[PDB]
Design a protein around this ligand. Structure first.
Ligand code: PDQ
Ligand code: PDQ
Ligand code: MG
Ligand code: MG
Lengths: 222, 481, 481, 222
DNA sequence: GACTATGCACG
DNA sequence: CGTGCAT
DNA sequence: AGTCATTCATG
DNA sequence: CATGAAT
């Protein structure tokens, strides 16, 4: 089930893929419903690189994604949104769902990415506040940004290290990661093809032995 | 191993048990702090657990596990949902819980699980708990018999009237609507001065409720009967504006709906009037509400039957609702139906007992320090002798006896003396001591005044009430016609 | 507000993050305490929260809310289920959580919710935590940065081998079977004496595992290869008896099934062989197990093809299973495949660092008290002068300076002196003090021995290990063929 | 869904109606499956005195109860158990389910009670234990019994005040409330008819005003 | 993490 | 039909 | 409070 | 087809 947008406009219509029903709720709350849609992903997404075709088409999330965007999977193109934006927790499990989503998009909806329609959205990692009726909060997204903020707010101000999207309200979600004029988005391009297909297959693939080496050679366990 | 009991004697007793606990300890508000036990346990636990509004928010699941294991012997779902409600600006007029994350909405959606959210108490909630630490109120044992629990909070304002309550138990129900903190305190205050206050005059200050969703309330005649007897029917109408649309078109805009109605569903029912074509002005129905604003635009066709259409909707959808007063709270451990007057008076008397008890507590604490201080003073004049005598003794208790037999100190006096560390010997100033003694004695006089001088007591009561008023007051959201 | 990143550079990094955390901090055991972080956080929290085995059981929901809000940033379901598992005598060989209520069964049923159950840690679990309070082990900050967390427990026995682990992460899996505490400690101990222990000799003490469900294990040749390389296939057969039934009838009775198999379902599969008539001796299949006993009776018809039938079932149902060794733990922050030897040695060295660190901690504590005591002794010889001097001074710090400049006491010495309460002046006995001094000094000598004398250290290690053995040992449940 | 008994014997077969899936689980665990059945009641039972007939027959619990016992509801009689035993928490909500069950039985299965086949089972209210490997626990069911126990166990022994059936294991459930030789059961008789029908109707009925008086006159709120 | 039935009084 | 603490 | 899908490796 | 910490 999907939470739609009042109007139909492929020129500027956003499709938000959110990690979890609960966060999606918050998503539906704060938002310009005149042109942005929430579509939640009820837990860990199908591995469309390690699953037969029968399973993929039968998967609730994937089908809903397909029929909601329109084109198909061959794929065709513009219907139906001019931004597909992925909004997940900033944690390891969040990162995992980004992996799983781009794998699918990469494999089936491949033109979408090339046309640069797929985005990942960067929720804030930190909130800084300095009590009660008079309280001030600012946001940071990085190591360095927080430094600037801590100096500004100086001593006495408490820091919060957001553990997920659930920890923040709808107004807060709007201000930081949804409102077009304040949001900071990542835009997935692809800077080759083959380099990609190898990476996507080694990682998201049915093999293991190669994944293990990739991890040995690459994952630095200090 | 077998007992015989009749069916007649089993049912009566079992039902008796359930009805009782459900009537008192589950569903019904205390007329004083206007709390139900879950709510009160939530406030009390979060507060005891220093989860105040001025400190960091904390993982709801933690709050509940703690409430559940320490105070409330029931389902986490029940504890949590009730927590969530207290976090809801639309349902309560003065929210008593601040929750971070998805805590629901008016469009009726499902609050996020306790495993996603974070909460702290609000600011005003500390006010209900105010002075709890100064033996101001009756405590009981938790089910474990390991910890004590307030049966009632000090209630620094009249939460019962302000936030309201509903409301389904055994043999009784209770529905009470929200009211303007400011207004209610003004009524409370008057009643303190003129106890025998007639309802008509009280109505002047507290006239009709104040739903957090605002809107239009009509039924002065009815509100009177409610505030009098306890039961009443009053009319609640969403707030309507007319907008004109380029093309000989008219739009009907709604920016407030009646307490406790599902905006998502209300909208569907309106669009349903249009599709099932049950009225003429049916055009498009659009809910355009985003954070920080409620806007429902129902736009019309060409034959702008506007007045006819709105009026139709007023009957046939819930854009106009009727609200019921069934004011049932627990007074003297039992259900009572009540009006502005009893709900007020019971409150006052409660604050009275609270205030007195508080003062009694504060005075004792003072007189105990005064007693020690007086001794500390004497000890200084004989410091040298006393120290030598402590050295002479054989143990702690022995010294205490010697001080008591020799210099006629007391127990409490001896004890304070003997535990004195060495650096305290660094300053033997009769003067600084005497200054404290002076303060303590003025404190005690003052307290003893509030205790045995009903008028001054009632005075303090009013001062505090007014202070709370200024801090927390806000303008009305509901309008009266 | 827009960034560009490639698909190639996104996936690698994201997957990197996930794989890393999943490999280290979720799915894989530490080779030392044999814990996964959830488990360790559970033990550590319940323990810190004085939820020990010797005190009352406490409302699971409370335990979890606390774990979740303070240590483990994940789902309560995950935390709770893992808690429940630790309460399961059939899955673990030495349960580390005691749970009251429905915590599941072998017939595979659903443990009751955390809102129904109650739990405390077990007795033996305190052993893993033993000495944690004496700076014996590396601490980190919780996600809040409000509290510190052990990265590893002192692990007073080899939980890794004893309880085992499984076991699914990214790029690696881990399966390790349970082992007899007693047996494992005997191996550990030998390796302490003879470090270069060859596997063949170690096998003599620790030979094959020990499943809590008992049963028959065959694969000596295979167990060797497992204990050597890390990977192995061994055969597990339920335990079978023959019962004779009045009527020329024979019954096959089963009183132990292989680790990790669903008795409820196993039974269904056996009855299924009978209905689908896939073998001859098919008669009735009955599961007659009640509390305190496992009994599966499969009774036959008349042509008692008993040996043929059991043998058939052995292949075609799970009454006979095969078990796999994939021994993968985290050593130096990274996944390693391992056999009896590394899993042993790493443990030993860990206990070493623990023991040394513990001793270093204990020695300091002593030398600090010794230092104060030595001063207390001097102070007695000049008590009169010292007291007068404290009186002379002007504040606490001033006295401390004066003692230090005048009598050459230290800071720590001055401080202990000046905080002395008055009753302490009651007893000025150089003798009692000197006795304590004597004890402290023998303690320090002893500690300093364990610290700088590897042999004695390794000795203490063995003593403790043996003590744990006697307390907690139990006879084998699995038999080897 | 019902957890049956291996054998079919109406001479001595027990049907346990348990409050909640979870407690029922514990029930199925500890028990002589040779002749006792667990049948759980997933939450608060239909009010078969304040609900039309259509609803009653459609209610999952009730139907399962009817078809499992056999007779019908007219009722007929012996099938199928020679004891129907009600096992609930010893709390207010437990008492409420006992109300709801006997109402149903009283109204429809009325002969069952008259023949004295309906029982209520008395879980213990207290456990007394005096540490670790050597620990001793005894049980009490009343004000007075605990007194005797506390003296026996004397000082040092901790008391537990069971808040529900979930708080105890299967072995414990067996020993105290299920094992025929140790269990203490209540047996519902009826000592009139009309007295009963009035009580059952005033309490469990569609009226309220009368219930309220009953409560005023009878429920002592101290 | 949605859904699913119930009691309890009432308009 | 729906309210809000319970199961 | 059951149920329902999914990841991750592996026999 | 499960296993067991995650969603
Ligand atoms: C069982 C049960 C239900 N069911 C499942 C089917 C139906 C049964 C047959 N009456 C009703 C149901 F529809 C809802 C709940 C529920 O909301 N909360 N919070 C619960 O805790 N439980 C369980 C009683 C404890 C629920
Ligand atoms: C959603 C969801 C499921 N579903 C429901 C249908 C299907 C959806 C469509 N992916 C999967 C499901 F089948 C099981 C769970 C679950 O066990 N635990 N512990 C959970 O927390 N969740 C939610 C993810 C957080 C579950
Ligand atoms: Mg997360
Ligand atoms: Mg209960």
């Amino acid at each position: 089930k999907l939470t739609p947008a009042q109007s139909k406009n492929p020129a500027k219509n956003e499709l938000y893929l959110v990690e979890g029903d609960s966060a999606g709720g918050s998503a539906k709350q704060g938002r310009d419903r005149k042109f942005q849609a929430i579509l939640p992903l009820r837990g860990k997404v199908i591995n469309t690189a390690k699953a037969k075709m029968a399973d993929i088409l039968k998967n609730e999330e994937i089908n809903t994604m397909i029929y909601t965007i329109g084109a198909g999977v061959d794929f065709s193109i513009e219907a139906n949104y001019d931004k597909i934006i992925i909004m997940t927790d900033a944690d390891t499990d969040g990162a995992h769902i980004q992996t799983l989503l781009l794998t699918f998009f990469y494999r089936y909806m491949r033109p979408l990415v090339e046309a640069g329609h797929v985005y990942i959205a960067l929720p804030p990692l930190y909130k800084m506040s300095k009590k009660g009726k008079k309280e001030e909060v600012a946001y940071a997204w990085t190591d360095g940004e927080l430094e600037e903020l801590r100096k500004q707010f100086g001593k006495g101000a408490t820091l919060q290290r957001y553990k997920g999207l659930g920890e923040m309200n709808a107004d807060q979600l709007w201000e930081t990661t949804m409102n077009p004029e304040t949001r900071t988005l990542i835009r997935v391009t692809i800077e080759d093809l083959a380099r990609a297909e190898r990476r996507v297959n080694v990682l998201m693939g049915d093999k293991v032995e190669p994944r293990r080496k990739w991890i040995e050679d690459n994952v630095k366990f200090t | 191993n077998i007992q015989n009991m009749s069916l007649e004697d089993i049912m009566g007793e079992r039902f008796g048990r359930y009805s009782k606990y459900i009537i008192q300890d589950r569903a019904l508000p205390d007329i004083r702090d206007g709390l139900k036990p879950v709510q009160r346990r939530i406030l009390y636990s979060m507060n005891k657990d220093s989860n105040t509004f001025d400190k960091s928010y904390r993982k709801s699941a933690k709050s509940v596990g703690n409430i559940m294991g320490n105070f409330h012997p029931h389902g986490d779902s029940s504890i949590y949902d009730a927590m969530v409600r207290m976090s809801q600006n639309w349902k309560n007029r003065e929210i008593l819980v601040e929750m971070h994350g998805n805590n629901g909405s008016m469009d009726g959606d499902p609050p996020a699980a306790m495993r996603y959210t974070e909460a702290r108490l609000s600011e005003i909630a500390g006010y209900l708990l105010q002075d709890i630490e100064k033996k101001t109120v009756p405590f009981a044992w938790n089910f474990d018999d390991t910890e004590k629990e307030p049966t009632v909070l000090p209630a620094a304002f009249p939460n019962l009237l302000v936030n309201g309550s509903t409301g389904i138990s055994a043999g009784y129900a209770t529905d009470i609507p929200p009211h303007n903190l400011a207004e209610v305190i003004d009524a409370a205050v008057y009643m303190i001065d003129h106890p025998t206050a007639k309802i008509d005059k009280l109505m002047e200050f507290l006239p009709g409720p104040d739903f957090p969703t605002g809107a239009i309330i009509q039924g002065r005649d009815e509100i009177k009967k409610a505030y009098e007897t306890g039961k009443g029917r009053v009319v609640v109408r969403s707030k309507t504006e007319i907008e004109k649309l380029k093309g000989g078109k008219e739009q009907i805009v709604i920016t407030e709906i009646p307490y406790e109605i599902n905006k998502a569903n209300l909208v569907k029912k309106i669009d349903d009037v249009r599709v099932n074509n049950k009225v003429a002005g049916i055009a498009e129905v659009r809910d355009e509400s985003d954070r920080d604003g409620l806007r429902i635009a129902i736009e019309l066709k060409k034959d702008a039957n506007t007045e006819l259409v709105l009026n139709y909707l007023f009957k046939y959808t819930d854009l106009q609702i009727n609200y019921n007063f069934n004011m049932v709270a627990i007074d003297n451990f039992t259900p009572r139906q009540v009006g502005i007057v009893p709900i007020l008076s019971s409150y006052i008397a409660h604050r009275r007992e609270v205030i007195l008890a508080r003062s009694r507590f504060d005075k004792e604490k003072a007189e105990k320090r005064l007693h020690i201080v007086e001794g500390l003073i004497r000890v200084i004049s004989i410091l040298d002798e006393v120290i030598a005598l402590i050295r002479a003794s054989e143990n702690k208790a022995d010294a205490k006896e010697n001080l008591k037999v020799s210099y006629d100190f007391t127990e409490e006096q001896a004890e304070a003396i003997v535990t004195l560390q060495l650096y305290r010997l660094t300053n033997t100033d009769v003067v600084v001591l005497q200054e404290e003694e002076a303060e303590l004695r003025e404190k005690i006089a003052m307290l003893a005044a509030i205790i045995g001088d009903e008028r001054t007591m009632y005075n303090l009561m009013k001062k505090e009430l007014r202070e709370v008023k200024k801090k927390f007051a806000t303008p009305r959201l509901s309008s009266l016609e």
